[PDB]
């Protein structure tokens, strides 16, 4: 089991860390959602699908910078949503193919009432997402750590 990103970086067998850079809607109103879709950013596969079933969770999702200060919301993982920043570990998603498959994670972030002006700065860290991979074969328990950076400013209108 290993993963790759939309910026040409990777994390091998055994886990590790990678940076991910996301284009964000430049204007988000209070009462509306900024959607940060990582399923177009992070992809993984199973290296022995004939024999091994891989299990993948979102173990933890943390907010940073302007997201920490200026937003609240949820994280959607494989069709169900949970509070973000996270308060538990999600259920497992199965990976059962050698073919790249997206990691089905998306943030739904809505501005807090005091947000206004530039609420997320270009280049800043906005989140860290921990993917936990296990399997039905041995005792491997690996963390794939995804550091999520904004490519651009996000403004909350006054």
Ligand X SMILES: CNC(=O)c1cc(C(=O)NC)cc(-c2ccc(O[C@H]3O[C@H](CO)[C@@H](O)[C@H](O)[C@@H]3O)c(C)c2)c1
Nearer to ligand X, 47 or 89 (CB): 47
Q: How far apart are CA 130 and CA 127, in angstroms?
A: 10
Size of the site for ligand X (CB under 6 A): 12
In the complex, the smallest distance separating the C-beta of residue 11 from ligand X, rounded to whole angstroms, is 11
Residues 46, 98: Cα–Cα separation, whole Å = 5
| Phi, psi of 71, rounded to the nearest 5 degrees | -135, 160
> By CB under 6 A, is residue 54 in contact with ligand X?
yes
Element (H, E) at 65: helix 65-70
What are the residues facing 84 on neighbouring strands? 73
Structure tokens at 154: 């996000």
Instruction: In angstroms, give the least distance from the CB of 116 to ligand X.
Output: 46
Of 86, 90, 110, 135, the residue at the interface with ligand X (CB under 6 A) is 135
Give residue 64's Cα distance to chain centre.
Answer: 13
Q: Is 47 in the site for ligand X (CB under 6 A)?
A: yes
48 binds ligand X, rule: CB under 6 A:
yes
Q: Which is nearer to ligand X, 53 or 152 (CB)?
A: 53
Residues that bind ligand X (CB under 6 A): 1, 13, 46-48, 50, 52, 54, 135, 137-138, 140
């Amino acid at each position: 089991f290993a993963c790759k990103t939309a910026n040409g970086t990777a994390i091998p067998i055994g886990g590790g860390s990678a940076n991910v850079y996301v284009n964000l809607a430049p204007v988000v109103n209070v009462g509306q959602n900024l959607v940060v879709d990582l399923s177009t950013q992070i992809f993984c596969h199973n290296d022995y699908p004939e024999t091994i079933t891989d299990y993948v969770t979102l173990q933890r999702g943390s907010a940073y910078g302007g997201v920490l200060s200026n937003f609240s919301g949820t994280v959607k993982y494989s069709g169900s949503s949970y509070p973000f920043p996270t308060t538990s570990e999600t259920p497992r998603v199965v990976y059962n193919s050698r073919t790249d498959k997206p990691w089905p994670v998306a943030l739904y972030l809505t501005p807090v009432s005091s947000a206004g002006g530039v609420a997320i700065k270009a280049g800043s860290l906005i989140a860290v997402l921990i993917l936990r991979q296990t399997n039905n074969y041995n005792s491997d328990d690996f963390q794939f750590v995804w550091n999520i950076y904004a490519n651009n400013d996000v403004v909350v209108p006054t």
